[PDB]
C-alpha cells in the first residue's frame, strides 16, 4: 500500500482545494501562494543579491562546498511563485547537495511574457559563469514550470555557445504548454492539485506553444548534461516527464527518470510532513553530488 503521510496530505489538499473550474483572480492565486509558504529551516542562511536585473537570494544550507552552485528556477505556472515561496524546499536541496542555491526571481507573466523567463534564466546562468563558477561546478534545478524553464535555459544557453553545466534536475517539469498529453485525462482523478491552460495562455501571449524554449519537449536536446527527472505517479503532468526522458535519450542525453508511486506534483515541497518529500530532495542532492565527482 501507500505511506500514511501522503494519504493525510492528499485528504488535506482535496479539502483546502478550490472546486474545479471556478475562476480565481491572479493577484489572489499569488497572495495565497505567499501566505501558505513554508518558512525555511532556522539553519538556512540567506543573502539578497541582484542578478541580471532580477532580485535573487543565495540560499546556503550548512555544509556548502565553496565553488559549487545551483541555479534554481521556482515553479508557479510562469505566472506566480517567488523567492519566498521556494526558500524552504530549496534550502533543503542546498542541504542535500552541499551547494549554495542561486534562487532567481525571474520575470513573471502576464506582466512579462515568454521569452522573458528564459531570458532571465540564461542571463542568470551567464552571471554565475562570470562570477567564476566553472560549468563543471554548476547545476540547474527547478520545479513545475521551473522544470520546463530549466530545460528551456539549457537549450537556449547551448544555442548561444554557453557551456552546459554538470547536471540538471527538473522536478515535476512542465515541458509542454499544449497540455494535450494522456496523463491529463488518465491521471486526473488522482492529482489533488483549464486552470493550467490559463497559465499557458498568460505565458505565451500569442506565441507558438510548440516553441522549443516554451515547450522543451519539442526542442533539440542534443548535448545537454546528465538529467535527473523526478515526477510523481499520481500527477497530471506524468507524460511531460516520460516524453522528456524519451526525447533526451533519443538526443543522446544521459537521462534518469524516476517515477515515484503515490506521489504528487512537486511533493518535495511538502518535505516537512512527508518523508518521501525529504527522501526525493536527498536524492536530488545525491545526484548533483554524484554528477560533480565524475
Short mmCIF file of C-alpha atoms in Angstrom, two decimals:
data_model
loop_
_atom_site.label_atom_id
_atom_site.label_comp_id
_atom_site.label_asym_id
_atom_site.label_seq_id
_atom_site.Cartn_x
_atom_site.Cartn_y
_atom_site.Cartn_z
CA UNK A 1 0.00 0.00 0.00
CA UNK A 2 0.83 3.76 0.38
CA UNK A 3 2.58 5.82 3.10
CA UNK A 4 0.15 7.32 5.62
CA UNK A 5 1.59 10.84 5.32
CA UNK A 6 0.63 11.13 1.65
CA UNK A 7 -2.90 9.88 2.36
CA UNK A 8 -3.30 12.54 5.08
CA UNK A 9 -1.83 15.23 2.86
CA UNK A 10 -3.96 14.20 -0.14
CA UNK A 11 -7.01 14.45 2.13
CA UNK A 12 -5.96 17.98 3.24
CA UNK A 13 -5.09 19.07 -0.29
CA UNK A 14 -8.53 18.00 -1.54
CA UNK A 15 -10.22 19.92 1.35
CA UNK A 16 -8.30 23.20 1.01
CA UNK A 17 -8.85 22.92 -2.76
CA UNK A 18 -10.91 25.38 -4.75
CA UNK A 19 -13.59 23.40 -6.65
CA UNK A 20 -12.95 22.72 -10.37
CA UNK A 21 -13.48 25.46 -12.91
CA UNK A 22 -14.11 28.43 -10.56
CA UNK A 23 -12.13 31.47 -11.68
CA UNK A 24 -9.55 32.65 -9.17
CA UNK A 25 -8.10 36.13 -9.94
CA UNK A 26 -4.32 36.23 -10.46
CA UNK A 27 -3.40 38.52 -7.61
CA UNK A 28 -5.42 36.13 -5.37
CA UNK A 29 -3.57 32.95 -6.51
CA UNK A 30 -0.32 34.96 -5.99
CA UNK A 31 -1.06 36.19 -2.46
CA UNK A 32 -2.35 32.79 -1.43
CA UNK A 33 0.80 31.03 -2.51
CA UNK A 34 2.77 33.60 -0.48
CA UNK A 35 0.69 33.11 2.67
CA UNK A 36 0.78 29.28 2.77
CA UNK A 37 4.54 29.09 2.01
CA UNK A 38 6.75 27.15 4.40
CA UNK A 39 9.33 29.05 6.36
CA UNK A 40 12.83 27.76 5.59
CA UNK A 41 14.85 25.86 8.28
CA UNK A 42 16.45 28.07 11.01
CA UNK A 43 19.97 26.96 9.92
CA UNK A 44 19.46 28.11 6.32
CA UNK A 45 21.30 31.40 5.74
CA UNK A 46 20.27 33.85 3.07
CA UNK A 47 21.85 36.81 1.21
CA UNK A 48 19.95 39.14 -1.07
CA UNK A 49 21.71 39.60 -4.44
CA UNK A 50 20.52 41.19 -7.67
CA UNK A 51 21.32 39.18 -10.84
CA UNK A 52 20.61 40.12 -14.48
CA UNK A 53 18.35 42.86 -13.13
CA UNK A 54 16.35 40.35 -11.05
CA UNK A 55 16.13 40.08 -7.29
CA UNK A 56 17.67 36.79 -6.12
CA UNK A 57 18.90 35.10 -2.95
CA UNK A 58 21.78 32.76 -2.35
CA UNK A 59 20.39 30.07 -0.16
CA UNK A 60 23.14 28.33 1.76
CA UNK A 61 22.33 25.35 3.99
CA UNK A 62 25.07 24.16 6.38
CA UNK A 63 27.83 22.28 4.59
CA UNK A 64 28.15 24.12 1.28
CA UNK A 65 31.26 23.27 -0.65
CA UNK A 66 32.91 26.50 -1.75
CA UNK A 67 32.90 26.83 -5.56
CA UNK A 68 29.77 24.85 -6.21
CA UNK A 69 26.35 26.36 -7.00
CA UNK A 70 22.82 25.52 -8.16
CA UNK A 71 20.84 27.79 -10.38
CA UNK A 72 17.35 27.26 -9.09
CA UNK A 73 14.15 28.11 -11.02
CA UNK A 74 10.97 28.18 -8.98
CA UNK A 75 7.52 26.88 -10.01
CA UNK A 76 4.20 28.80 -10.29
CA UNK A 77 2.96 28.27 -13.87
CA UNK A 78 5.14 31.17 -15.11
CA UNK A 79 2.52 33.50 -13.56
CA UNK A 80 3.31 33.14 -9.80
CA UNK A 81 5.76 31.91 -7.16
CA UNK A 82 8.73 33.87 -5.83
CA UNK A 83 11.99 33.56 -3.86
CA UNK A 84 9.77 33.47 -0.80
CA UNK A 85 7.56 30.55 -1.94
CA UNK A 86 10.55 28.34 -2.64
CA UNK A 87 13.15 29.25 0.03
CA UNK A 88 12.31 26.20 2.23
CA UNK A 89 12.48 23.33 -0.32
CA UNK A 90 15.46 25.00 -1.99
CA UNK A 91 17.10 25.37 1.39
CA UNK A 92 16.84 21.59 1.70
CA UNK A 93 18.26 20.99 -1.81
CA UNK A 94 21.27 23.08 -0.78
CA UNK A 95 21.49 20.79 2.31
CA UNK A 96 21.34 17.57 0.38
CA UNK A 97 23.71 18.71 -2.34
CA UNK A 98 26.26 20.60 -0.22
CA UNK A 99 25.91 23.52 -2.59
CA UNK A 100 24.64 27.14 -2.35
CA UNK A 101 21.49 27.85 -4.37
CA UNK A 102 21.03 30.92 -6.51
CA UNK A 103 17.29 31.37 -6.20
CA UNK A 104 16.19 33.64 -9.03
CA UNK A 105 13.13 35.98 -9.03
CA UNK A 106 12.69 35.77 -12.84
CA UNK A 107 10.11 37.91 -14.66
CA UNK A 108 6.58 36.56 -14.46
CA UNK A 109 3.66 36.54 -16.94
CA UNK A 110 1.37 38.17 -17.93
CA UNK A 111 3.28 41.35 -17.00
CA UNK A 112 6.37 39.96 -18.78
CA UNK A 113 5.53 37.08 -21.13
CA UNK A 114 7.70 34.46 -22.81
CA UNK A 115 10.65 34.50 -23.51
CA UNK A 116 11.18 36.84 -20.55
CA UNK A 117 11.61 33.97 -18.06
CA UNK A 118 14.11 32.16 -20.36
CA UNK A 119 15.99 35.40 -20.92
CA UNK A 120 16.26 35.76 -17.22
CA UNK A 121 17.49 32.18 -16.66
CA UNK A 122 20.07 32.24 -19.45
CA UNK A 123 21.29 35.52 -18.03
CA UNK A 124 21.28 34.14 -14.51
CA UNK A 125 23.49 31.38 -15.87
CA UNK A 126 25.89 33.78 -17.66
CA UNK A 127 26.18 35.72 -14.39
CA UNK A 128 27.30 32.63 -12.49
CA UNK A 129 29.91 31.87 -15.11
CA UNK A 130 31.19 35.49 -14.97
CA UNK A 131 31.48 35.11 -11.17
CA UNK A 132 33.91 32.30 -11.86
CA UNK A 133 31.97 29.18 -11.13
CA UNK A 134 33.19 26.53 -13.55
CA UNK A 135 30.44 24.97 -15.66
CA UNK A 136 31.56 21.63 -14.23
CA UNK A 137 30.79 23.07 -10.72
CA UNK A 138 27.26 24.12 -11.63
CA UNK A 139 23.79 22.55 -11.66
CA UNK A 140 20.31 23.66 -12.79
CA UNK A 141 17.16 22.63 -10.98
CA UNK A 142 13.57 23.83 -10.89
CA UNK A 143 10.05 22.59 -10.33
CA UNK A 144 6.73 22.54 -12.27
CA UNK A 145 7.01 25.48 -14.73
CA UNK A 146 10.51 25.92 -13.31
CA UNK A 147 11.31 22.41 -14.50
CA UNK A 148 10.39 23.40 -18.02
CA UNK A 149 12.44 26.58 -17.73
CA UNK A 150 15.46 24.51 -16.59
CA UNK A 151 15.30 22.73 -19.92
CA UNK A 152 14.46 25.87 -21.81
CA UNK A 153 17.50 27.68 -20.39
CA UNK A 154 19.75 24.72 -21.23
CA UNK A 155 18.61 24.62 -24.85
CA UNK A 156 18.80 28.37 -25.20
CA UNK A 157 22.23 28.59 -23.46
CA UNK A 158 23.51 25.88 -25.78
CA UNK A 159 22.24 27.65 -28.94
CA UNK A 160 24.25 30.62 -27.58
CA UNK A 161 27.65 28.93 -27.06
CA UNK A 162 27.37 28.85 -23.28
CA UNK A 163 28.86 25.64 -21.83
CA UNK A 164 26.49 23.04 -20.36
CA UNK A 165 26.66 22.71 -16.56
CA UNK A 166 27.39 19.31 -14.88
CA UNK A 167 23.80 18.20 -14.22
CA UNK A 168 20.20 19.23 -14.43
CA UNK A 169 17.25 18.27 -12.24
CA UNK A 170 13.74 19.11 -13.43
CA UNK A 171 11.24 18.35 -10.67
CA UNK A 172 7.75 17.55 -12.00
CA UNK A 173 8.64 19.57 -15.12
CA UNK A 174 6.01 21.31 -17.15
CA UNK A 175 7.54 20.99 -20.59
CA UNK A 176 4.57 21.08 -22.97
CA UNK A 177 2.36 24.14 -23.00
CA UNK A 178 -0.02 22.40 -25.34
CA UNK A 179 -1.40 20.41 -22.35
CA UNK A 180 -2.73 17.58 -24.53
CA UNK A 181 -0.88 14.57 -23.05
CA UNK A 182 -2.76 11.41 -21.95
CA UNK A 183 -1.92 11.92 -18.29
CA UNK A 184 -4.30 14.92 -18.08
CA UNK A 185 -7.19 12.52 -18.78
CA UNK A 186 -5.66 9.32 -17.31
CA UNK A 187 -4.13 10.72 -14.04
CA UNK A 188 -6.75 13.46 -13.38
CA UNK A 189 -8.81 11.81 -10.64
CA UNK A 190 -5.57 11.11 -8.66
CA UNK A 191 -3.83 14.56 -8.68
CA UNK A 192 -5.27 16.58 -5.75
CA UNK A 193 -3.61 19.70 -7.24
CA UNK A 194 -8.46 24.80 -17.67
CA UNK A 195 -6.53 26.46 -14.79
CA UNK A 196 -3.20 25.27 -16.19
CA UNK A 197 -4.42 26.20 -19.69
CA UNK A 198 -4.89 29.72 -18.41
CA UNK A 199 -1.29 29.87 -17.39
CA UNK A 200 -0.10 28.73 -20.77
CA UNK A 201 -2.33 31.47 -22.21
CA UNK A 202 -0.86 34.07 -19.89
CA UNK A 203 2.71 32.94 -20.53
CA UNK A 204 2.68 32.55 -24.31
CA UNK A 205 0.73 35.67 -25.12
CA UNK A 206 0.09 34.51 -28.68
CA UNK A 207 3.35 32.60 -29.15
CA UNK A 208 3.79 29.21 -30.71
CA UNK A 209 3.05 26.72 -27.92
CA UNK A 210 5.50 24.28 -29.61
CA UNK A 211 8.28 26.81 -29.39
CA UNK A 212 11.45 24.96 -28.30
CA UNK A 213 12.03 27.46 -25.49
CA UNK A 214 8.34 27.45 -24.29
CA UNK A 215 7.74 23.69 -24.58
CA UNK A 216 11.22 22.00 -24.37
CA UNK A 217 9.62 18.63 -25.08
CA UNK A 218 9.70 19.84 -28.74
CA UNK A 219 13.31 21.08 -28.72
CA UNK A 220 16.59 19.64 -29.83
CA UNK A 221 18.18 18.36 -26.63
CA UNK A 222 21.45 17.23 -28.25
CA UNK A 223 24.33 17.92 -25.95
CA UNK A 224 22.55 18.68 -22.65
CA UNK A 225 24.30 17.44 -19.46
CA UNK A 226 23.02 14.46 -17.48
CA UNK A 227 19.38 14.77 -16.31
CA UNK A 228 17.62 13.52 -13.18
CA UNK A 229 13.86 13.85 -13.66
CA UNK A 230 11.57 13.43 -10.68
CA UNK A 231 7.79 13.09 -11.20
CA UNK A 232 5.01 11.52 -9.17
CA UNK A 233 2.86 8.67 -10.50
CA UNK A 234 -0.32 10.48 -9.37
CA UNK A 235 0.10 13.74 -11.19
CA UNK A 236 -1.42 15.25 -14.31
CA UNK A 237 1.97 16.02 -15.76
CA UNK A 238 3.36 12.44 -15.74
CA UNK A 239 3.56 12.34 -19.54
CA UNK A 240 5.54 15.55 -19.77
CA UNK A 241 8.17 13.73 -17.81
CA UNK A 242 8.03 10.40 -19.67
CA UNK A 243 8.18 12.11 -23.07
CA UNK A 244 11.05 14.27 -21.80
CA UNK A 245 13.03 11.16 -20.83
CA UNK A 246 12.39 9.53 -24.21
CA UNK A 247 13.24 12.80 -26.06
CA UNK A 248 16.51 13.15 -24.08
CA UNK A 249 17.67 9.57 -24.62
CA UNK A 250 16.79 9.90 -28.32
CA UNK A 251 19.04 13.02 -28.49
CA UNK A 252 21.98 11.33 -26.80
CA UNK A 253 21.41 12.91 -23.37
CA UNK A 254 22.13 10.85 -20.23
CA UNK A 255 18.62 10.79 -18.73
CA UNK A 256 17.44 9.19 -15.45
CA UNK A 257 13.68 9.17 -14.96
CA UNK A 258 12.28 8.26 -11.55
CA UNK A 259 8.50 7.98 -11.33
CA UNK A 260 7.59 7.83 -7.63
CA UNK A 261 4.50 5.81 -6.65
CA UNK A 262 1.56 7.54 -4.89
CA UNK A 263 3.28 10.96 -5.24
CA UNK A 264 2.04 14.33 -6.28
CA UNK A 265 3.24 17.41 -8.14
CA UNK A 266 6.43 18.68 -6.54
CA UNK A 267 5.94 16.52 -3.46
CA UNK A 268 9.41 17.63 -2.46
CA UNK A 269 7.81 20.90 -1.33
CA UNK A 270 5.95 19.14 1.42
CA UNK A 271 9.11 17.71 2.90
CA UNK A 272 8.32 18.91 6.45
CA UNK A 273 5.46 16.49 6.83
CA UNK A 274 6.07 13.98 4.05
CA UNK A 275 9.01 11.53 4.33
CA UNK A 276 9.06 10.89 0.51
CA UNK A 277 9.37 14.69 0.35
CA UNK A 278 12.64 14.68 2.24
CA UNK A 279 13.70 11.43 0.52
CA UNK A 280 13.47 12.85 -3.04
CA UNK A 281 15.27 16.04 -2.11
CA UNK A 282 18.06 13.94 -0.59
CA UNK A 283 18.22 12.09 -3.89
CA UNK A 284 18.26 15.30 -5.92
CA UNK A 285 21.31 16.26 -3.83
CA UNK A 286 22.99 12.88 -4.06
CA UNK A 287 22.69 13.04 -7.83
CA UNK A 288 24.06 16.58 -8.04
CA UNK A 289 26.95 15.26 -5.96
CA UNK A 290 27.25 12.05 -7.99
CA UNK A 291 27.50 14.22 -11.13
CA UNK A 292 30.11 16.55 -9.69
CA UNK A 293 32.54 13.76 -8.60
CA UNK A 294 32.71 12.21 -12.15
#
